[PDB]
Amino acid sequence: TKPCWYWDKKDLAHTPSQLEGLDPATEARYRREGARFIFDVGTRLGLHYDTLATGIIYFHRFYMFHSFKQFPRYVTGACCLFLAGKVEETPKKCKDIIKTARSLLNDVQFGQFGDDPKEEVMVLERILLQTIKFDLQVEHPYQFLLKYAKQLKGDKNKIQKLVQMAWTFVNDSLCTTLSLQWEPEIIAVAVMYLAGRLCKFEIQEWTSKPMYRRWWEQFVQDVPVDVLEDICHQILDLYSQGKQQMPH
Amino acid sequence: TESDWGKRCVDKFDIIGIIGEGTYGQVYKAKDKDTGELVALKKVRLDNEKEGFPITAIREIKILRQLIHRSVVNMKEIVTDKQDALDFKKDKGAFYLVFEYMDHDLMGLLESGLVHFSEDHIKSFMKQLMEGLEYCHKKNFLHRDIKCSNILLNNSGQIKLADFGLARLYNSEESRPYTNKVITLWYRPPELLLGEERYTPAIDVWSCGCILGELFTKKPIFQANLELAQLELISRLCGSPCPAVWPDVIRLPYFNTMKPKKQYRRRLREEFSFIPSAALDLLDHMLTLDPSKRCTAEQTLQSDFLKDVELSKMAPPDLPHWQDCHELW
Amino acid sequence: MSYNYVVTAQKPTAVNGCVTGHFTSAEDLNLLIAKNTRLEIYVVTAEGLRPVKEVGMYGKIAVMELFRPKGESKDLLFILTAKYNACILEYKQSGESIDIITRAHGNVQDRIGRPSETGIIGIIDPECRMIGLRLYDGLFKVIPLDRDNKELKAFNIRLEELHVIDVKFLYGCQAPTICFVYQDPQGRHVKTYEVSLREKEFNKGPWKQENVEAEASMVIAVPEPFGGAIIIGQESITYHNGDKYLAIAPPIIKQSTIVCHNRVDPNGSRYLLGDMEGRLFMLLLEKEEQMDGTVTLKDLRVELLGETSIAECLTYLDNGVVFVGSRLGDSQLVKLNVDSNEQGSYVVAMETFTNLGPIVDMCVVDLERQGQGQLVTCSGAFKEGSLRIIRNGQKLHIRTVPLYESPRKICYQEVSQCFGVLSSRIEVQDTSGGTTALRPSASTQALSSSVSSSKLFSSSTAPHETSFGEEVEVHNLLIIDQHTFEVLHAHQFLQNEYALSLVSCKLGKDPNTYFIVGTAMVYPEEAEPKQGRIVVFQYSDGKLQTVAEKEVKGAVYSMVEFNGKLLASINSTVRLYEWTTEKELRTECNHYNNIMALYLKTKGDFILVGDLMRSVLLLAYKPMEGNFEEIARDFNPNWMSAVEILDDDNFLGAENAFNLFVCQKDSAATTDEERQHLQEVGLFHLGEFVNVFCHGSLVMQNLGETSTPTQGSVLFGTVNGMIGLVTSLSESWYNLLLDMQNRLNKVIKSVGKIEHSFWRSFHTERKTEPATGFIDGDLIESFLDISRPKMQEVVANLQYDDGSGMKREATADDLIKVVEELTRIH
Ligand SMILES: CC(C)c1nn(-c2c(Cl)cccc2Cl)c2nc(Cc3ccc(OCCO)cc3)[nH]c(=O)c12
């Protein structure tokens, strides 16, 4: 019926990219760059956040089936956004994505697009569609972050600080393979859980079950804390690997 | 696995012929070589590459995989032509959307006009259509192109909606600007004729309302060639749009522009007096001018006309297959 | 775009209705006969009919009634066309000048309504206060006959009884009153209402509902001496008038359905009744006068008079003379005698008016090696069935060959100097368990005979029970000599086997010429036949030999010879068979993308397929591969009655809505989608039901015939007996003829003031399109009949194009010459 889009962390040691001699740090870097390319390009074009994420999820999924050495990442990124726009009904013309990609890429990077940028991107659409098995519908942590926050009642200002801090964590998790390890519902909870710890908030008090210390179980059944901690640790790992610090 | 779409080859189907012309390619009738099932293949051509893959098809793939209902057409898989090449970037081979084959289409069955539709046949037909629309509306999807040709019927009496090419998600909280020229003039609601963007799901109800009337006369209700003439015909029957019945009609762009000849009174019950009482009241609510006062799909299912219809007792319309050829002397 | 020309070679002959009255003068007795689109006016004499006037109307005549409102000297005529064009007409004669006046006119179509099952009904009040029209279920339309209603404006009264069978205005009522039989789930009932022009609604009627026979068919309004109404059914005749109720159920009428009625005595003492088997009865109202001075109806009696042609309409004229208007066979004048003849009959035929009847099939054959061609039709039905031989000689010469059974298909086999004809006759389940024919006919009066002994469907595990009295069709292949039209041989097919298709040809390397028949096993239980045969016969030495049979899983609706191979359509499938050296049929290739492959035509390696609802599809045989290919399909949905190929690119079709259309290959190689699109470039409302298209012409060809502008020749036969001809034009010739039509339509006065452009517009219940690609040759050929002032008016400012001279002005004498050449194609 529907395909399975989630792998175990241990499985990422065997992406095509890894087995062609790319080391783990480099593939992680390529993923961040490709995702942030998609993010930045679409933001310049004024695209809805769902459209950016959908392109990123396509991009992440794509390189579970192909190697970064045979498919230049920024071409792939551009193509993903193009289709993402048509899927999410925020369409853009391919020529406009190229224009923006050229504005943001230097001369070396734009070399990936070859002699005809538009053609290289349009051609890849066939491969992308077959790669993602035409499973175009994608859900993202954002909608769950809001669906669950709406059910929190309490200090308007403390809850809004939680939401914005968690939202930023969602934007940052798109640069990672979490999109490939855990369903979005878990991500939304994980980012709430992380923002709560950082803000010294005890979310259970805002739930309909204020003495249910595991506040998330009423939102997402069957989630081990270990899973949430693994996700949080991975988000904070990205924050430490940079110079940037937690938003607070 | 069954989910790995886009890889299986169209070699696996014996093509029977071209049933019809679609939007993004021709539609073909075919038989699966392995199982013997009849399917309908919609050809999607990306060779033009003006915008690559057609969005119309993207909507049909995105939505119809989510939607599973007895009265919605089941997309089975997507198959491709032989690459004919080991290297990509040289492939123009098209993709085919596999659907369940449907024996007949409603317009086709009507255009012959010797099809007889009793009250019980209409009950069974309409209930399935509304149940499918309700399924789609609960999932917050708008068909936006409901016409007779889009309704499909096989001989068992099963009704299935199809051609979701223009379907898009509707958000009640966030008003979203829409295209505003989506439904065929004959089945377009007065709100769209007045250039109302951000339309409600009630547009689909109006179209299904025009069909309800059409099934009792065998003739479409509002036949016009131009947007103004259509508003006039609707007005001769439903009454002219005016704040008296449509408080927000003044906000619609073309209200001061597209005035009908007169400010007509509503005659729907008079010109349809030959319709059963349970059905006629359903029509009046479905053909209500103000989309905020127009009934919903769920409300149609909770009507005296459709509430107590039994889904099991399909009651198929009698279709002539012998003695139709030679007219009885 | 494509350009074509359509003319009538023989006008409609079937009688669709007939009335009497005082229409031409308050003094004369008139007989108005309505054939499809044609009105014939006669005057009754002591010998027969004197014709006085004939007009054509731009519409099918649906209602025809004579009435005389207070203040008029003579009867006026009301006519309503099938496109709902209404009008009131007057006859006016000025010495030698006869013309028809349009006194009132308009179109009474409703924007919303469901057309009724029993068709348009029109009746007029005895006091001529209003015209009643039943056009839609649940509605009764009233045209009040006031002097000011020159546009025939009308209003609808809501009618509760949705399914109405028949209605009449009653005699002897204080107010205008209607009597109608209607059907609801509890059976059929007779009910009455009063019509109020002041209130514009119904009021409670004079007498209560009575339950009537389930198959109550017709309502008779009886004149004032008795009053009330008579209800005719299948088994019983009943009279109702308030509390009075009578019922006679004589066994004689049960045998055949009664279809027509007419009053003989203005008193209402006597009526005529006719039934489908052609019998003519007298219905007698026996009076009894009471001491009040009042006369009541004592009893009803039915007396058989004799046999007439199966009549759509009867009308008694005067003395003993009755006009029999027949749709299935020849119309008649018959005299009713007081004394029976030695055979017991009171009916003796006077005159016989030719009716080509329903033309089920036909072929063109040069019987006398004349280069001309004679047209041989399958005409009529049941006892009226016949072949007709038709040749030009200025009128058509027509020989009639009676068959007394229904002819279905005809094909000519020259090698055998004879015709093959498929036929079916009606037998009835009898007390022997078998069946008995109601009369002898061609398939029983054959010189030599044979009966199929095929064992193919011999298991017949599925039971088919028979009840005494039920009808069955018995199908035969007739071998008929081309000079004498003697039935040389009759082959009877299997029980419940229908013969649907017939060809004569040679196959493969086989030198023998065969008759091949395609059949279907028809059982009342089956929605669609699932068994059938292709049978190969050889007619040799006065005997028909069964050569080979091929079983098929369906009905062989159509067959045609295809480059020495046999092309047959079985239900949805279109199949190509080869004829082996072992004299058996062998399948080569199949095509399945059809709903029902009803009609087939070929040209070269191309095949045109006519479908029940999917219009026409162009196939091609690809010899390099040994299979079929789909070339192009007409996606617009049309119900087909007959198809024909005009040339390698244009295709002609006939719709069940009485429409003609022409499809062409788009011949644009931009997209494979365009090539596969057959574009409907010709649309034309014919007004007739086309059963058969046939290439050929009846015009004598001495080879000296001037080459006419028209190219090609297709004849077609219709249900009303009308025979037509379709031919092609050059772009230059079409534009001239078309520009001239628009000029003629402004000049020529239409009966009922019906716009010609409206009449010829393509029309279904769901669509109306302006005609295109077709020249109404009958309009063009009327230029020769208009007065000189009108001719010169037509040619004013008329220019020619794409000719020797690019722009060339036309004169009245110029067009008379062109039209006269166009009259020579038929
Ligand atoms: C792809 C599937 C969902 C589909 N599509 N369509 C369609 C629509 Cl939804 C709109 C316009 C035209 C067509 Cl063909 C469809 N029609 C129909 C009705 C239909 C039309 C023609 C048929 O014989 C052609 C004989 O040469 C048989 C059936 N049956 C479908 O299955 C279908």
Short mmCIF file of all heavy atoms in Angstrom, two decimals, chain B residues 16-18 26 105 111-112 114 214 216 218 223 236 271-272 274 321-322 324 329, chain C residues 111-112 114 137 158 327 522 527 557 593 596 612-614 630 639 673 676-677 766:
data_model
loop_
_atom_site.label_atom_id
_atom_site.label_comp_id
_atom_site.label_asym_id
_atom_site.label_seq_id
_atom_site.Cartn_x
_atom_site.Cartn_y
_atom_site.Cartn_z
N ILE B 16 -6.19 -2.05 -24.77
CA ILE B 16 -7.38 -2.39 -25.53
C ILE B 16 -7.76 -1.28 -26.50
O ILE B 16 -8.19 -1.54 -27.62
CB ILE B 16 -8.55 -2.72 -24.58
CG1 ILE B 16 -8.27 -4.06 -23.89
CG2 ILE B 16 -9.86 -2.74 -25.35
CD1 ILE B 16 -9.23 -4.38 -22.77
N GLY B 17 -7.62 -0.03 -26.07
CA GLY B 17 -7.95 1.10 -26.92
C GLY B 17 -7.98 2.36 -26.09
O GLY B 17 -7.72 2.35 -24.89
N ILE B 18 -8.31 3.46 -26.76
CA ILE B 18 -8.36 4.78 -26.14
C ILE B 18 -9.82 5.08 -25.81
O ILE B 18 -10.63 5.34 -26.71
CB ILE B 18 -7.72 5.85 -27.04
CG1 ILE B 18 -7.94 7.24 -26.41
CG2 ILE B 18 -8.24 5.78 -28.46
CD1 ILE B 18 -7.35 8.38 -27.20
N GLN B 26 -3.95 11.13 -23.05
CA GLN B 26 -5.10 10.31 -23.40
C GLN B 26 -5.30 9.21 -22.37
O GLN B 26 -4.35 8.80 -21.69
CB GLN B 26 -4.92 9.73 -24.80
CG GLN B 26 -4.79 10.80 -25.87
CD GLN B 26 -4.22 10.26 -27.16
OE1 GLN B 26 -3.10 9.76 -27.19
NE2 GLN B 26 -4.99 10.37 -28.24
N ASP B 105 -19.80 6.33 -18.26
CA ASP B 105 -19.81 7.65 -17.65
C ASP B 105 -21.22 8.23 -17.74
O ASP B 105 -21.97 7.92 -18.67
CB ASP B 105 -18.78 8.58 -18.31
CG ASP B 105 -19.09 8.87 -19.77
OD1 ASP B 105 -19.42 7.92 -20.52
OD2 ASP B 105 -18.98 10.05 -20.17
N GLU B 111 -26.46 11.15 -22.76
CA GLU B 111 -26.53 11.64 -24.13
C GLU B 111 -27.32 10.68 -25.03
O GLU B 111 -27.98 11.13 -25.97
CB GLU B 111 -25.12 11.88 -24.70
CG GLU B 111 -24.47 13.22 -24.28
CD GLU B 111 -25.17 14.48 -24.78
OE1 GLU B 111 -25.92 14.41 -25.79
OE2 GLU B 111 -24.97 15.56 -24.17
N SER B 112 -27.28 9.36 -24.75
CA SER B 112 -28.16 8.46 -25.49
C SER B 112 -29.61 8.72 -25.12
O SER B 112 -30.51 8.67 -25.97
CB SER B 112 -27.82 6.99 -25.18
OG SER B 112 -26.58 6.62 -25.74
N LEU B 114 -32.01 7.21 -23.77
CA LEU B 114 -32.99 6.16 -23.57
C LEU B 114 -32.79 5.45 -22.24
O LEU B 114 -33.50 4.48 -21.95
CB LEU B 114 -32.94 5.15 -24.71
CG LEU B 114 -34.16 4.22 -24.75
CD1 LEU B 114 -34.67 4.10 -26.18
CD2 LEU B 114 -33.85 2.84 -24.20
N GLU B 214 -30.90 17.37 -13.02
CA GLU B 214 -30.70 16.78 -14.34
C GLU B 214 -31.18 15.33 -14.40
O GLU B 214 -31.74 14.90 -15.41
CB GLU B 214 -29.21 16.87 -14.70
CG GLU B 214 -28.83 16.43 -16.10
CD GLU B 214 -27.45 16.92 -16.50
OE1 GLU B 214 -26.97 17.91 -15.90
OE2 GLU B 214 -26.86 16.34 -17.44
N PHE B 216 -33.72 14.05 -13.02
CA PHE B 216 -35.17 13.98 -13.08
C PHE B 216 -35.73 14.48 -14.40
O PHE B 216 -36.91 14.23 -14.69
CB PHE B 216 -35.79 14.79 -11.94
CG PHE B 216 -35.83 14.06 -10.63
CD1 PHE B 216 -34.86 14.25 -9.67
CD2 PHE B 216 -36.85 13.15 -10.37
CE1 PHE B 216 -34.90 13.57 -8.47
CE2 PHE B 216 -36.90 12.47 -9.17
CZ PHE B 216 -35.92 12.68 -8.22
N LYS B 218 -33.41 14.44 -17.39
CA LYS B 218 -32.48 13.94 -18.41
C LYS B 218 -31.86 15.07 -19.21
O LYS B 218 -31.18 14.80 -20.21
CB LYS B 218 -33.18 12.93 -19.33
CG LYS B 218 -33.77 11.76 -18.55
CD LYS B 218 -34.50 10.75 -19.41
CE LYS B 218 -35.12 9.68 -18.51
NZ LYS B 218 -35.95 8.69 -19.26
N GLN B 223 -27.98 25.64 -18.93
CA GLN B 223 -27.19 25.51 -20.15
C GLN B 223 -27.03 26.90 -20.74
O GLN B 223 -28.01 27.52 -21.17
CB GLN B 223 -27.84 24.55 -21.13
CG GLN B 223 -27.90 23.14 -20.61
CD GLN B 223 -28.62 22.20 -21.55
OE1 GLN B 223 -29.84 22.28 -21.73
NE2 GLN B 223 -27.87 21.30 -22.18
N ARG B 236 -33.46 33.12 -13.34
CA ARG B 236 -34.85 32.85 -13.69
C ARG B 236 -35.44 31.75 -12.80
O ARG B 236 -36.66 31.70 -12.60
CB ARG B 236 -35.03 32.45 -15.15
CG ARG B 236 -35.09 33.61 -16.10
CD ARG B 236 -35.40 33.14 -17.51
NE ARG B 236 -35.24 34.23 -18.46
CZ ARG B 236 -35.16 34.07 -19.77
NH1 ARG B 236 -35.26 32.88 -20.33
NH2 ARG B 236 -34.99 35.14 -20.54
N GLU B 271 -41.25 25.29 -11.14
CA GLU B 271 -40.77 24.67 -12.37
C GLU B 271 -40.33 23.23 -12.14
O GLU B 271 -40.15 22.50 -13.13
CB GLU B 271 -39.65 25.53 -12.97
CG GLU B 271 -40.15 26.92 -13.42
CD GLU B 271 -39.25 27.59 -14.45
OE1 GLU B 271 -38.33 26.92 -14.97
OE2 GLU B 271 -39.46 28.79 -14.73
N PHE B 272 -40.17 22.80 -10.89
CA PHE B 272 -39.87 21.41 -10.57
C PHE B 272 -41.01 20.72 -9.81
O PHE B 272 -40.76 19.77 -9.06
CB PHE B 272 -38.58 21.30 -9.75
CG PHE B 272 -37.33 21.48 -10.55
CD1 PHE B 272 -36.64 22.68 -10.54
CD2 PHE B 272 -36.82 20.42 -11.30
CE1 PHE B 272 -35.48 22.83 -11.27
CE2 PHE B 272 -35.67 20.57 -12.03
CZ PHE B 272 -34.99 21.77 -12.02
N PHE B 274 -43.03 18.59 -10.57
CA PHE B 274 -43.21 17.18 -10.90
C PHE B 274 -42.23 16.27 -10.15
O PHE B 274 -42.23 15.06 -10.41
CB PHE B 274 -43.06 16.96 -12.41
CG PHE B 274 -41.75 17.44 -12.97
CD1 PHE B 274 -40.62 16.65 -12.92
CD2 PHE B 274 -41.65 18.69 -13.57
CE1 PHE B 274 -39.41 17.09 -13.43
CE2 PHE B 274 -40.45 19.13 -14.08
CZ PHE B 274 -39.33 18.33 -14.01
N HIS B 321 -29.61 -3.15 -23.50
CA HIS B 321 -28.56 -3.85 -24.23
C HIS B 321 -29.08 -4.78 -25.32
O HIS B 321 -28.28 -5.18 -26.19
CB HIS B 321 -27.66 -4.65 -23.26
CG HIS B 321 -26.78 -3.78 -22.40
ND1 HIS B 321 -25.67 -3.14 -22.89
CD2 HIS B 321 -26.85 -3.47 -21.08
CE1 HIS B 321 -25.09 -2.46 -21.92
NE2 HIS B 321 -25.78 -2.64 -20.81
N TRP B 322 -30.37 -5.12 -25.34
CA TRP B 322 -31.00 -5.84 -26.45
C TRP B 322 -32.36 -5.21 -26.74
O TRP B 322 -33.05 -4.76 -25.82
CB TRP B 322 -31.20 -7.34 -26.16
CG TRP B 322 -31.85 -8.08 -27.33
CD1 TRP B 322 -33.08 -8.67 -27.32
CD2 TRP B 322 -31.31 -8.30 -28.65
NE1 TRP B 322 -33.35 -9.23 -28.55
CE2 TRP B 322 -32.27 -9.02 -29.38
CE3 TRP B 322 -30.11 -7.95 -29.27
CZ2 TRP B 322 -32.08 -9.40 -30.70
CZ3 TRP B 322 -29.91 -8.34 -30.59
CH2 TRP B 322 -30.89 -9.05 -31.29
N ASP B 324 -32.67 -2.51 -28.12
CA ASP B 324 -32.32 -1.11 -28.35
C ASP B 324 -31.86 -0.90 -29.79
O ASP B 324 -32.16 0.13 -30.40
CB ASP B 324 -31.21 -0.69 -27.39
CG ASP B 324 -30.07 -1.71 -27.34
OD1 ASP B 324 -30.17 -2.76 -28.01
OD2 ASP B 324 -29.08 -1.46 -26.62
N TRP B 329 -41.29 -1.71 -33.73
CA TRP B 329 -42.27 -1.21 -34.68
C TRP B 329 -43.60 -0.96 -33.96
O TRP B 329 -44.09 0.16 -33.91
CB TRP B 329 -42.48 -2.19 -35.83
CG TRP B 329 -41.21 -2.57 -36.56
CD1 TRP B 329 -40.85 -3.83 -36.95
CD2 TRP B 329 -40.15 -1.71 -36.98
NE1 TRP B 329 -39.64 -3.80 -37.59
CE2 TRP B 329 -39.18 -2.51 -37.62
CE3 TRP B 329 -39.92 -0.33 -36.87
CZ2 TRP B 329 -38.01 -1.99 -38.15
CZ3 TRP B 329 -38.75 0.19 -37.41
CH2 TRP B 329 -37.81 -0.64 -38.03
N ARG C 111 -38.28 25.59 -20.31
CA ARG C 111 -36.89 25.50 -19.89
C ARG C 111 -36.65 24.23 -19.09
O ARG C 111 -35.61 23.57 -19.25
CB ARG C 111 -36.53 26.76 -19.09
CG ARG C 111 -36.50 28.02 -19.98
CD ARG C 111 -36.02 29.27 -19.26
NE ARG C 111 -36.93 29.67 -18.19
CZ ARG C 111 -37.89 30.59 -18.32
NH1 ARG C 111 -38.09 31.22 -19.46
NH2 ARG C 111 -38.65 30.88 -17.27
N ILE C 112 -37.61 23.84 -18.25
CA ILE C 112 -37.48 22.67 -17.39
C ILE C 112 -38.70 21.77 -17.55
O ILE C 112 -39.84 22.24 -17.45
CB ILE C 112 -37.31 23.06 -15.91
CG1 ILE C 112 -35.96 23.74 -15.69
CG2 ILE C 112 -37.47 21.84 -15.02
CD1 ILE C 112 -35.80 24.32 -14.32
N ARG C 114 -39.73 17.07 -17.86
CA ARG C 114 -39.36 15.73 -18.27
C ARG C 114 -40.29 15.27 -19.39
O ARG C 114 -41.50 15.15 -19.15
CB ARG C 114 -39.43 14.74 -17.11
CG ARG C 114 -39.04 13.32 -17.56
CD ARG C 114 -38.87 12.34 -16.40
NE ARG C 114 -40.12 11.97 -15.76
CZ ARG C 114 -40.45 12.25 -14.51
NH1 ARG C 114 -39.63 12.93 -13.71
NH2 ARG C 114 -41.61 11.83 -14.03
N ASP C 137 -44.03 15.26 -18.07
CA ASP C 137 -44.59 14.57 -16.92
C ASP C 137 -44.95 15.58 -15.84
O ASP C 137 -44.16 16.49 -15.53
CB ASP C 137 -43.60 13.54 -16.38
CG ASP C 137 -43.63 12.23 -17.15
OD1 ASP C 137 -44.52 12.07 -18.02
OD2 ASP C 137 -42.76 11.37 -16.90
N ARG C 158 -50.03 22.57 -12.47
CA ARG C 158 -49.44 21.41 -11.83
C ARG C 158 -50.39 20.22 -11.92
O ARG C 158 -51.59 20.35 -11.64
CB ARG C 158 -49.11 21.71 -10.38
CG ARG C 158 -48.48 20.53 -9.66
CD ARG C 158 -48.27 20.85 -8.20
NE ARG C 158 -47.81 19.68 -7.46
CZ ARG C 158 -48.62 18.81 -6.88
NH1 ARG C 158 -49.94 18.96 -6.92
NH2 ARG C 158 -48.11 17.77 -6.23
N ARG C 327 -48.58 3.29 -41.23
CA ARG C 327 -47.16 3.57 -41.10
C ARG C 327 -46.29 2.39 -41.48
O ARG C 327 -45.16 2.58 -41.95
CB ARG C 327 -46.81 3.89 -39.64
CG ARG C 327 -45.32 3.94 -39.37
CD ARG C 327 -45.01 3.97 -37.88
NE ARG C 327 -43.71 3.36 -37.61
CZ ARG C 327 -43.33 2.87 -36.44
NH1 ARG C 327 -44.13 2.90 -35.39
NH2 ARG C 327 -42.12 2.33 -36.33
N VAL C 522 -31.34 -15.61 -28.96
CA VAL C 522 -32.09 -14.61 -28.22
C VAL C 522 -33.03 -15.35 -27.29
O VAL C 522 -33.93 -16.06 -27.75
CB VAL C 522 -32.85 -13.68 -29.18
CG1 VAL C 522 -33.77 -12.76 -28.41
CG2 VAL C 522 -31.87 -12.91 -30.05
N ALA C 527 -30.15 -10.07 -21.05
CA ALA C 527 -30.03 -8.65 -21.37
C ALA C 527 -29.34 -8.45 -22.71
O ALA C 527 -29.72 -7.56 -23.48
CB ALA C 527 -29.25 -7.94 -20.26
N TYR C 557 -23.84 -8.82 -35.04
CA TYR C 557 -24.70 -7.71 -35.43
C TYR C 557 -24.42 -7.26 -36.87
O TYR C 557 -25.33 -6.77 -37.54
CB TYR C 557 -24.51 -6.51 -34.49
CG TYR C 557 -25.03 -6.68 -33.08
CD1 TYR C 557 -24.15 -6.73 -32.01
CD2 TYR C 557 -26.39 -6.74 -32.81
CE1 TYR C 557 -24.60 -6.86 -30.71
CE2 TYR C 557 -26.85 -6.88 -31.51
CZ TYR C 557 -25.96 -6.94 -30.47
OH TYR C 557 -26.42 -7.08 -29.17
N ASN C 593 -12.24 -2.66 -28.08
CA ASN C 593 -12.58 -1.38 -27.44
C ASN C 593 -13.89 -0.83 -28.01
O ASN C 593 -13.94 0.19 -28.69
CB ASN C 593 -11.45 -0.36 -27.63
CG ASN C 593 -11.62 0.86 -26.74
OD1 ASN C 593 -12.16 0.77 -25.64
ND2 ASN C 593 -11.17 2.02 -27.22
N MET C 596 -20.87 -1.83 -28.03
CA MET C 596 -21.61 -2.75 -28.89
C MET C 596 -21.30 -2.37 -30.34
O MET C 596 -21.70 -1.30 -30.79
CB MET C 596 -23.10 -2.68 -28.61
CG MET C 596 -23.89 -3.91 -29.01
SD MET C 596 -25.59 -3.84 -28.39
CE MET C 596 -25.30 -3.67 -26.63
N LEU C 612 -23.07 1.58 -30.15
CA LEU C 612 -24.39 1.92 -29.64
C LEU C 612 -24.42 3.33 -29.06
O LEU C 612 -25.37 4.08 -29.30
CB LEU C 612 -24.82 0.91 -28.57
CG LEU C 612 -26.18 1.14 -27.93
CD1 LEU C 612 -27.33 0.62 -28.80
CD2 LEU C 612 -26.22 0.54 -26.53
N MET C 613 -23.40 3.71 -28.28
CA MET C 613 -23.34 5.03 -27.65
C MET C 613 -22.05 5.79 -27.88
O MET C 613 -21.99 6.97 -27.51
CB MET C 613 -23.58 4.91 -26.13
CG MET C 613 -22.76 3.83 -25.45
SD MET C 613 -23.02 3.67 -23.67
CE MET C 613 -22.38 5.23 -23.05
N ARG C 614 -21.02 5.18 -28.46
CA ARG C 614 -19.71 5.79 -28.60
C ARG C 614 -19.43 6.29 -30.02
O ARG C 614 -18.27 6.40 -30.41
CB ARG C 614 -18.64 4.79 -28.17
CG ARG C 614 -18.55 4.46 -26.66
CD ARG C 614 -17.78 5.53 -25.86
NE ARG C 614 -18.55 6.65 -25.34
CZ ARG C 614 -19.02 6.73 -24.10
NH1 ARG C 614 -18.85 5.76 -23.23
NH2 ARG C 614 -19.66 7.84 -23.73
N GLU C 630 -6.17 1.18 -33.90
CA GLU C 630 -7.11 2.29 -33.75
C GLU C 630 -6.52 3.53 -34.41
O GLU C 630 -5.41 3.95 -34.06
CB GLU C 630 -7.39 2.56 -32.27
CG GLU C 630 -8.30 1.54 -31.61
CD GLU C 630 -8.77 2.00 -30.24
OE1 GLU C 630 -7.98 2.67 -29.54
OE2 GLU C 630 -9.93 1.71 -29.88
N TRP C 639 -25.68 8.06 -30.21
CA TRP C 639 -26.34 6.78 -30.50
C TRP C 639 -26.49 6.64 -32.01
O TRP C 639 -27.09 7.50 -32.67
CB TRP C 639 -27.69 6.70 -29.81
CG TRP C 639 -28.33 5.34 -29.89
CD1 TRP C 639 -27.91 4.27 -30.63
CD2 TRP C 639 -29.48 4.89 -29.15
NE1 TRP C 639 -28.73 3.19 -30.42
CE2 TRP C 639 -29.70 3.54 -29.51
CE3 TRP C 639 -30.34 5.49 -28.23
CZ2 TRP C 639 -30.75 2.79 -28.98
CZ3 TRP C 639 -31.38 4.74 -27.70
CH2 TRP C 639 -31.58 3.41 -28.08
N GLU C 673 -2.26 12.86 -30.39
CA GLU C 673 -3.61 13.06 -29.85
C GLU C 673 -4.54 13.67 -30.89
O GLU C 673 -5.71 13.28 -30.99
CB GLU C 673 -3.50 13.96 -28.61
CG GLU C 673 -2.32 13.57 -27.70
CD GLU C 673 -2.26 14.33 -26.39
OE1 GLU C 673 -3.27 14.94 -26.00
OE2 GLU C 673 -1.18 14.32 -25.76
N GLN C 676 -5.60 11.04 -33.51
CA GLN C 676 -6.60 10.14 -32.96
C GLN C 676 -7.93 10.83 -32.72
O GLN C 676 -8.87 10.17 -32.26
CB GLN C 676 -6.09 9.49 -31.67
CG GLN C 676 -5.21 8.28 -31.95
CD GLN C 676 -4.41 7.83 -30.74
OE1 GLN C 676 -3.58 8.56 -30.21
NE2 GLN C 676 -4.66 6.60 -30.30
N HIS C 677 -8.06 12.12 -33.03
CA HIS C 677 -9.31 12.84 -32.79
C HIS C 677 -10.05 12.93 -34.13
O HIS C 677 -9.59 13.59 -35.07
CB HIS C 677 -9.04 14.23 -32.21
CG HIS C 677 -10.27 14.92 -31.71
ND1 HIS C 677 -11.39 14.22 -31.33
CD2 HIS C 677 -10.53 16.22 -31.45
CE1 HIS C 677 -12.31 15.07 -30.89
NE2 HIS C 677 -11.81 16.29 -30.95
N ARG C 766 -30.66 17.07 -25.09
CA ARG C 766 -29.60 17.69 -24.31
C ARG C 766 -28.82 18.76 -25.07
O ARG C 766 -28.21 19.62 -24.43
CB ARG C 766 -28.63 16.61 -23.81
CG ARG C 766 -29.29 15.66 -22.82
CD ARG C 766 -28.38 14.49 -22.45
NE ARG C 766 -27.12 14.95 -21.89
CZ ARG C 766 -26.92 15.23 -20.61
NH1 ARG C 766 -27.89 15.11 -19.72
NH2 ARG C 766 -25.72 15.64 -20.22
#
